[PDB]
Design a protein around this ligand. Structure first.
Ligand SMILES: [Mg+2]
Ligand SMILES: [Mg+2]
Lengths: 375, 375
């Protein structure tokens, strides 16, 4: 049975609360070299969502990666939130991964919710040389973004990393979740040959907003996602800020499968565009480009989707990935399915699996309308 | 004390459900003017929202005006829904009004929620010659749209009525809400000199969709809202279908006050544009213009509004109405306030009242962000 009291001492969450939690968002699972793990789907006390506790020779709390706050404006918000200096890292468009070495010496890659992903743990070890780092720092958790075209979760091609890559943006302690300061983190990771996310600079607080404005303009025309701004000593939480092109990219994806996104969502992205227009557009022409960009990002993917379904095609997206074998592919599919993803293996050859994700809500509703169903 | 058994008799809603709704709402008021009356805020069995029961010498149920289903497509939806023929009336963009002569001999104009609007009651009597009609038809309710640029509730310029006018789109029986057949209704109104909404035609179903498609193209290029489609004998309920220019107008208004509407207002309207692009756009030039209209309708009001609040202005909306005197104006404000509207008389000159609506939600949230508050 579950050692609630032990968990209570390691988490600061009273055993009573943890039994309340078990009614719903606290799940026991068998995970890693035959070990028993408690996964927190919801925050609870200081424990972030996706926190996972491994019940090994010793008990290890792999804390959830904390939510990062968003700002819609650079000024006065940056000066209002930070103090003295701001570190500005690239926000990579991928999926969040925590890599930890457990007490058993087994290495684990956790998705945001706390599940071990068979695809990700394998690509982590294939792509990263982790052995020396974990021998010297076993109680540090490597927090990074898994990115690439051949990414089964969020596919964006970052040609300077290859078809699939990884970039580290945090080192956090087991149990406490305490982050290393920015510059020390980057240097440490360098000395062990691990890859850091791009850092644009560390700027004096009075110059930071205008520096980010330039950076964002640059990222925008390259189609990169945006920026994460950080207190160099991590005593003040980070802020994220994204580019107009990132918003159009998300909105176009969303209006390609309009009924699979929990309605807004949508309003959230458009509001970003309003405040950004207010702050960053330096001519009417620029605002009219922004308008056009937004209109087409919404209309055309929708139009094509409806056209496509009209012609008999179900809504789906394919991603081709590396797998160990067809069995590994299938195991990954099961993992996606239990996450609530409608997925199947659509093709397989060698170690290349075509993962097909279905968007049935969009297929159903657009079909029903096409057949005379009423709004 | 409320005669629930009598209301059950006259509405078919069980006593129990009435008492329970009264325990929430379902609300009790005095109107016209030593009459006690019952206002149904929500639907309840066959009774529509905005139903009002007048407890006078006769017990009269002024039924709420029914919701009208919307369609996103002309084909095959019209012929899946209707039977044999389709009457196609212009959809007017104003506000919905029910005019009834009560058993007491008093004439009353109800807005959609069931409230007597003192402004509207006076304007209807000035605009319309009702007395011969109601003397011969005391139990018919006149259902229409009050339209025009100088509107107290929703303003759009309709040249054919001047600053403000009225168009009848339904005659419905007290108590039963039974509507007269379309063509009979139209002739009846003509013979008493009452003004009908435009009726473009009555078409066989096989031709109805391409006919509407042309009407809509005409209404769009003319800035009109759209169309309400109807079974001539009203055996099947009506469908409403709106133009692209209507959607732009709606979105532009909404995004002038983004945090007071929705979140959609946005998703609902945008989706209309997708299907309409698919069915009606003849060329990619048309879809391109559609996307431009959409994006501008979104970005520009939002930008203008952020600018305006950034410069110290609160978010508000002014409309000018022709009133009898300052007293009439001041009466209309009191009415708005007791419905929970944040309104004031911003100005009065020579029979013209400037009615100012405040939107604190938009003001406060845009202000929060502007002062460096976090999303
Ligand atoms: Mg992301
Ligand atoms: Mg309307």
């Amino acid at each position: 049975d579950i050692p609630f009291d032990l968990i209570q001492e390691r988490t600061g969450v009273p055993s009573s609360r943890l039994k309340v939690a078990f009614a719903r968002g606290s799940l026991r699972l068998l995970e890693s070299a035959g070990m028993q793990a408690l996964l927190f789907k919801k925050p609870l006390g200081d424990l972030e969502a996706g926190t996972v506790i491994y019940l090994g020779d010793e008990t290890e709390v792999i804390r959830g990666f904390p939510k990062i706050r968003r700002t819609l404006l650079l000024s006065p918000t940056i000066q209002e939130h930070f103090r003295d200096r701001v570190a500005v890292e690239e926000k990579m468009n991928g999926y969040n991964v925590r890599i930890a070495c457990l007490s058993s010496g087994e290495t684990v890659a956790l998705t945001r919710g706390g599940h071990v992903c068979p695809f990700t743990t394998r690509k982590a070890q294939e792509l990263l040389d982790l052995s020396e780092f974990f021998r010297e720092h076993p109680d540090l958790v490597i927090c990074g973004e898994m990115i690439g075209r051949d990414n089964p979760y969020v596919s964006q091609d970052y040609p300077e990393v290859g078809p699939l890559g990884f970039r580290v943006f945090d080192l956090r302690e087991k149990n406490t979740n305490r982050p290393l300061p920015v510059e020390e983190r980057r240097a440490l990771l360098d000395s062990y040959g691990l890859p850091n996310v791009r850092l644009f600079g560390v700027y004096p607080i009075e110059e930071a907003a205008s520096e980010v404005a330039d950076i964002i303009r640059a990222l925008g025309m390259a189609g990169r996602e945006g920026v994460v701004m950080k207190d160099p000593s991590m005593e003040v939480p980070p802020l994220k800020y994204t580019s107009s092109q990132a918003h159009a990219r998300e909105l176009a994806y969303a209006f390609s499968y309009p009924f699979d996104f929990g309605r807004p969502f949508f309003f959230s992205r458009v509001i970003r565009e309003g405040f950004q227009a207010y702050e960053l557009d330096e001519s009417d022409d620029e605002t009219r480009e922004r308008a056009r960009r937004l209109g087409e990002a919404i209309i055309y993917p929708m139009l094509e989707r409806i056209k496509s379904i009209s012609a008999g095609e179900a809504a789906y997206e394919d991603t081709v990935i590396d797998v160990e074998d067809r069995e590994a592919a299938e195991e990954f599919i099961r993992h996606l399915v239990r996450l609530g993803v409608s997925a199947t293996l659509a093709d397989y050859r060698d170690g290349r699996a075509t993962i097909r994700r279905f968007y049935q809500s969009t297929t159903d509703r657009i079909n029903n309308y096409l057949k005379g169903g009423l709004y």
